[PDB]
Amino acid sequence: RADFLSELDSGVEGLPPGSALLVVKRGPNAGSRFLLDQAITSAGRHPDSDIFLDDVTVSRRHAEFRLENNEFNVVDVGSLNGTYVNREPVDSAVLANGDEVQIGKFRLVFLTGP
Amino acid sequence: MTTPSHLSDRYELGEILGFGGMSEVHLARDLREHRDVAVKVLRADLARDPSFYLRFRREAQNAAALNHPAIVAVYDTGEAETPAGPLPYIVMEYVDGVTLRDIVHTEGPMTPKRAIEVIADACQALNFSHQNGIIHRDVKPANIMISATNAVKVMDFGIARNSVTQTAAVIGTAQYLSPEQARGDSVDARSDVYSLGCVLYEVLTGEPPFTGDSPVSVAYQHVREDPIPPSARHEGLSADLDAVVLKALAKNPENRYQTAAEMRADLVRVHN
Numbered sequence: 137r138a139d140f141l142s143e144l145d146s147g148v149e150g151l152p153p154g155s156a157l158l159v160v161k162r163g164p165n166a167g168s169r170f171l172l173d174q175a176i177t178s179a180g181r182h183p184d185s186d187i188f189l190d191d192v193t194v195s196r197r198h199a200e201f202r203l204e205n206n207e208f209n210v211v212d213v214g215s216l217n218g219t220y221v222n223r224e225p226v227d228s229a230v231l232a233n234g235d236e237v238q239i240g241k242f243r244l245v246f247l248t249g250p
Numbered sequence: 251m252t253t254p255s256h257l258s259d260r261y262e263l264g265e266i267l268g269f270g271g272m273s274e275v276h277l278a279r280d281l282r283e284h285r286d287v288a289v290k291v292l293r294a295d296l297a298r299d300p301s302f303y304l305r306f307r308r309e310a311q312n313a314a315a316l317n318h319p320a321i322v323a324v325y326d327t328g329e330a331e332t333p334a335g336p337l338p339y340i341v342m343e344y345v346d347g348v349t350l351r352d353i354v355h356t357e358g359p360m361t362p363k364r365a366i367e368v369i370a371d372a373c374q375a376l377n378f379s380h381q382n383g384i385i386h387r388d389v390k391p392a393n394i395m396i397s398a399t400n401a402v403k404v405m406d407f408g409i410a411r412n413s414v415t416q417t418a419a420v421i422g423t424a425q426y427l428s429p430e431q432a433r434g435d436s437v438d439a440r441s442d443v444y445s446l447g448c449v450l451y452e453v454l455t456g457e458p459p460f461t462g463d464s465p466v467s468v469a470y471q472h473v474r475e476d477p478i479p480p481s482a483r484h485e486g487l488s489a490d491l492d493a494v495v496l497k498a499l500a501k502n503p504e505n506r507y508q509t510a511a512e513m514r515a516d517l518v519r520v521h522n
């Protein structure tokens with residue numbers, strides 16, 4: 137069931153301390169990655185987005201990745217199609233190493249150090 | 251509570267032709283151009299809901315205006331300042347007829363000759379859409395209408411190339427989803443080729459290629475399970491026609507018809 141999009145129903149090495157990495161798992165942008173090293177990292181189809189995700193189903197203002205209490209979390213800022221963490225629709229969720237974030241048709245894997 | 255008699259000073263609303271998800275389509279009179287039109291509007295009972303208004307506003311803004319005989323034309327879009335708030339609307343070419351969904355449900359499976367002619371005309375509509383940089387993404391029997399003069403009319407094309415956000419096509423019965431759409435892989439024009447193959451399968455046999463208790467089960471089948479040849483599901487279907495349906499329904503887009511125009515040429519060859 138995990139192989140499909142959500143609508144159908146300790147850590148890694150080489151990352152600077154206190155930082156995380158989002159990797160596109162599949163599709164045209166497979167292999168593309170984004171380093172999370174700020175307190176707030178915006179993700180959307182708007183050109184000024186920190187994590188620019190060009191896809192018709194991604195909202196201009198879709199989500200934000202927040203670094204709070206030495207840990208990362210994803211928050212939906214009011215998108216059309218929502219944000220999913222491990223196939224489950226969420227408003228806000230704390231991220232652990234290996235978690236899958238779905239923004240539009242993008243299947244991102246969240247990676248962090250131990 | 252009721253629907254307004256007019257959407258601006260130009261469109262006089264008549265009878266309701268049908269209903270969508272959050273919408274209703276009225277037969278209307280274009281008082282400026284002196285013609286009958288179909289006006290898709292947000293349901294009167296949902297008009298005061300800001301969530302439905304926001305969702306329908308995007309839909310009106312994204313309604314693609316393509317001029318082709320096999321495509322339902324979008325003449326105008328707007329927002330009527332209704333005493334119950336703003337009401338977004340899509341003015342379309344009025345189609346006096348029924349969807350392919352209605353025909354398969356009431357009449358049953360089509361004759362091989364008619365089913366080929368319907369899908370060949372749908373290929374022409376998709377080819378024109380692709381030439382305009384638009385992938386349909388939601389090819390299904392409900393999005394294809396047949397008029398009183400037997401004209402094929404494909405609807406629900408989106409504006410494709412600040413751009414307005416589109417809804418996820420993945421939601422629904424999943425019976426017409428291509429493997430790449432179900433998986434979240436790259437989507438090109440061959441996805442419309444696959445989905446039209448699903449429609450061609452249904453108009454020929456009376457049922458879609460894959461059925462299941464859940465959309466996950468159907469999506470799984472689209473990706474891994476091979477479809478049963480149309481002849482094995484319904485009598486009086488040639489091997490040449492079987493080869494066309496099964497080529498369009500190939501798992502790898504590389505093995506399908508590479509263009510909608512290519513799919514049409516093979517259908518016309520079988521039609522002879």
Ligand SMILES: Nc1ncnc2c1ncn2[C@@H]1O[C@H](COP(=O)(O)OP(=O)(O)CP(=O)(O)O)[C@@H](O)[C@H]1O
Nearest residue numbers: 267268269270271272273275288322342343344345
């Ligand atoms: N241009 C047109 N001319 C005539 N009838 C039309 C029409 N457009 C739509 N209809 C009628 O209205 C019905 C509902 O239209 P449609 O399927 O496009 O709505 P929709 O876009 O809200 C569905 P969804 O919520 O699944 O996206 C159709 O089944 C058909 O009977």
Ligand SMILES: [Mg+2]
Nearest residue numbers: 270271309406
């Ligand atoms: Mg629609």
